[PDB]
DNA sequence: GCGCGCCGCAGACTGTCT
DNA sequence: AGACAGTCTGCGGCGCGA
């Protein structure tokens, strides 16, 4: 229940002590810890591998955080202060100021608008083949009515432009594949779920959920847009909107797959944590090897051999060279026994612990401890880089 | 008329007698072991103009119902019987498709075989796929080789159409086709996939082989091994195995059978297509000659041992089916099967954490007090014997001096230490790390390994599942012993006290039930323990049947093959192909002539937490057409009830069995089964299986072990108590149940079936064979009576469906059920005809077993389904998130009543 | 100026015509970047993360929100982009209608919730818990790439600049020496991928309380423009943001405890992208970007012959290069295929390092054409060693 | 009621160490 | 150079589908 203390003790969550579920789900957290930032980077990298670079015709795009042009009243219950609530009752001391939302910009609440704006240029980039995609990971701002505040959510959005005849199965394919990405990296994949839903105008769609301990919460929405937004934004002509499906030029139906990576991070952090059955109440965050922020922990042994710090720096640098994040625990001072240090790396979700000791200058053997199994291996210091790369790659495979 | 809620009869006269001296026996046996105070509310009467009789008798009506039709199938069978084939064609040229092979050589090419009688067989190339190959059509005109595009290398890859043998000519007659496994060749006849009806029917050699001299269960294997336990052994020499290379030696004689020893025809790729093609074609021609000879000698034996033409015509119409699967059926082959893969990869992951959390023990010997992982290895082993400045190259040279330092004190060059320091059970179940099959964690670990019931806490008082001295199970029940805790695995060796592993259990997924209660939990861990042992319950159906549901070959028909009813409909898609799959079902698969198919003809009812239980679902009708079908409300219960009629007096009130199941209901009253055995016994859904064990004729010990399976009864407690249902229902015969004339029919010599006179298998014939086995012949009586009921429906819908202008004739009978693919415009009237045949057949059985009147409560259906798709009930769902989403559902209708006062003719 | 239309045509810079002026690109009021520009920005951020955060064992990530909560915002002090609430941006109001406040009492100048202008402030709030992270060891760092919102000078525009901040907590005695550390290290990082490193330079400067500073400049063709700045600010910001007890403020240095001086290293990745584009451009129209920084590494083509078999082997090579982590342009699945000297020098304008031509020789023996961006020669190579050549490339340019 | 998979297990060989 | 580590392989059983 109260596992969040660990995310404050080992810095995955924000600095402020009065953290609750509502502030985390709404986006009013003060920030994330460095391990949380690295877990967000791992989640974004896995999303980019599974969605963007592997799948053909998916292209990167950026949306600005602000909308510069004039626009409608917008998504606010309170209609600024010019119309909804004025100071006193209609008093004026005396224009350019207090011009309401006529010339006022808007912070973005979705990445769909930027991708739809860049659709014509990105269709010019491609050879106008109609199966197409635009992907973006970025921070979206939402007003939260705590009674007003800002909630910042890292949203990963894929806008898939699809032919209308096959949109009903393209949405089902992304329903399978996005839910498969959530089924991957999960200790309990049954907590991730999906629900079929309908729009107010009859458009179908799907919503992906995670079963948090308090209740089921939304993490991703797949929505079908039948030319409602694409035709509205470009109403001058439909000739520029026409794309080549096979031989025929037709207007593409839109599919918005928008998930939030901060709540996905919280879902994976809750999924990693699991005080029943055996008496092994070990506080370990069982993150996946490709989502764990720190892969390996490197340390100094009890024996007073000063020269081994050079060996630790060499191993640290060769593991940094080949894309393995290392906790520099060899710099640590007054280490108070190995068991709470091991519990510290278990709470930080570090896959392996490397103990460079006095007996590694001869015979090349360093101690290695796994996160999953609390057992030690006297493995040679050579080919450990290949072993960690093989472990990460073959954990990615299955 | 109003005494038992009977109805007036327009047909079936000659029952002018009142059944005198039989009514008061029914009254005195209703007042004993029966309430007799039923209000007996009259059902609403039904009046409609029925077609008249044939010979003014129901026996004379159902006779010549099977002779008005199938008379072409008698003269074509006679023409196949009388003629003599040319001995052997030696050439067997490649040619192109069909080629006429007469008495001479010279290989004259023909487009299609123009003969009314054909003996036929297909042996397909299994490695290429399901395309027909090596089909020879022997016939009194010619041997008729059909090479099926084996000579031409180039062919279509998928979406197979216009491929099979094309035996049907254009109109610008009836062409009877015989063959061993004629369903397998019938999938490759061509024009059996057409949406409109076919004038051509089929005969199966194994249908006549299991119709006379068939083998049920015990005799079938006994004569396999040969090729009371001590009897006359005449069933050995009088019958042969249903599979090939046994029928030919028994009836024809001579050689046993030719057989290819290399057996590469099922293993033939695109290579090896040219080698030994002639020897393969010679072996196939010899096999079809063997089937021709055995069919020629078994034609009069079948026509005289089954002299009622209803049996032969019912085999003829049940041999033809039509199961139209939609374009999303292959979608069912995707979204189910890959989902199984998902539940294959999650559950194994849920196993691996259960291993990994098991390695968090041993720290100060955390095992040896845990009752699941105390007897494991847990052993240790280890051995070895032979800028301001850069400041970066020193670390590089330090590690590169530690590199190549492995060369001295390398313990072995190729690493033998496979995870030393890990426990010995965890030194197993891990990939080597030297092989390319390496994958992280404790992989290559399965459910069936002996360490798996130790990893997850099975908590059946400490259930180990250790294979030595087990035989599938162990002493696990209760009471006193070992560590004086219930303690299944303390000291196995001296005593198996409190034994529950008495050998004789099914031992084969018997633990799929008793997951719900009956102990057998999955530990208090929550996250990974109980997440598994529910997943195998989800994938138990698809794990054993993914091979059978797949490789069901489908021919998506083109736009030209779609008739005018399909084209230009309000609901129609040319992208959606509605080509059918023909079922590979034998019309006689046991001693009874019931259709047997492991894929389609099973008890599947769209059960939740099952991956692929929507197999009965889909099978969407073509546009403009409707599947109209009805489950029989009470099949074997009513047959055994009217079997008791007129031998312990008539008027359907002979026994307490004969009184119930027609006036009683499932919701209220005693209709046997669940309603009275929830009072006699504790079974709720197992009460149906128990009562089927009584009625089907198993006996006391089968019921004893069956109730032993579901309960903590001791064996003396099983003998003394709770077996009294068999004692109270059946007294000493050989009370509420009568088994007298059932046993006399089981011991009757020549006439066996009461309704048709169809003989029993000669293996179960009591004159030639001293059938001292028992407990299988009563099964033959009840199941073959159900077969005769099925045949009496199938001989019906002729001149209530033939002369009347409705299309149909697609028998999709599964267990006790009848479906017909008719037009949507006359679907309600087709359901009315499907009610009319239910009236006529139940009156036929009432005509045969005693008197001529029939009660109204069984005279019509409770429901006939006019649903688009096939399902058990019309308002059901499936394990997919929504049945109406994706494929469209019209949700069906019950339609219990007769329709209206419209004309019985169309007259549109 | 020709570089602007080349980058627009080859989809480095988004927007039709509004980004043609260099003043829109020097600020952040350009409408966006192309997919090649977005991948280049991701490459530059990843290389900055490896050079600053990964390779230094003490530099740690930080998470600064794009907005301040602004509940106790000072009136008329750092009042740039205050209004927010997801739906208003009033920019700067020199003239105000003071009926009761600037706009309202609870809306403007109080509880406004200002958007961020620099990422130094987020690291300065997270300093206490990140000091707990390094077990109070003083000279450590907090670094982050983030978007900065600035006013752009009748209305005032929004400038969104992608900037990397490194905030260095140091003991004050060696603080100028750590300034000299980052002074040469950031400059060598900017000269690491430069085709001509003489354009990048650094200069010294003076402020009122920091008393020292260094500005890193790039020599654009119009003139020298700031791409990175360094400042040794005192404990004024830390004591201002935490008034009161200094016991949480001071940290453990060599044999003692002392309050840390802060070093602010702020680099504009958007001006860095513009600097590297102007450096990559120099006869024929090419973009000679660095192999570590180029958005697309290899260009795989379909060639000439049967389309199905070449398509299948190109799909296999594409999946192999994707599984090995190399970004590859799909010049296959395009049926245009005009002639020579077009689709070549278009990939050079797309800054793709190598281009692969898969022809019928690949179906014969496995040989494909490789043409380099740096040199115009073509080379015959097997399929199996293409991945090994491409993995020895880029990494060869990384280790000079 | 059998063949064919899928694990245990007990040789018997295989290979290496000193 | 035999003494002594470990890897296939050929049996028994158990379930279980054609």
Author numbering:
A (entry chain B): 68 to 161, 169 to 221, 229 to 355, 362 to 485
B (entry chain A): 78 to 249, 262 to 316, 340 to 498, 534 to 627, 740 to 993, 1054 to 1227
C (entry chain C): 67 to 219, 227 to 355, 368 to 485
From the paper:
DNA polymerase (DNAP) can correct errors in DNA during replication by proofreading, a process critical for cell viability. Here, we present an ensemble of nine high-resolution structures representing human mitochondrial DNA polymerase Gamma, Polγ, captured during consecutive proofreading steps. The exonuclease (exo) site is located ~35 Å away from the polymerase (pol) site, with no direct path between them. Altogether, our findings suggest a conserved ‘bolt-action’ mechanism of proofreading based on iterative cycles of DNAP translocation without dissociation from the DNA, facilitating primer transfer between catalytic sites.
Backward translocation of Polγ is now needed to separate the primer from the template strand and to deliver the mismatched base into the exo site. In the Backtracking Initiation complex, Polγ has translocated 1 bp backward as compared to the G-loop Engagement complex observed in Structure VI. The transition from the Mismatch Uncoupling to the Mismatch Locking complex requires forward translocation of Polγ by one bp without major conformational changes. This suggests that Structures III-VI, obtained from analysis of the Complex TWO dataset, represent proofreading steps that follow the Mismatch Uncoupling but precede conformations captured in Structures VII-IX from Complex ONE.
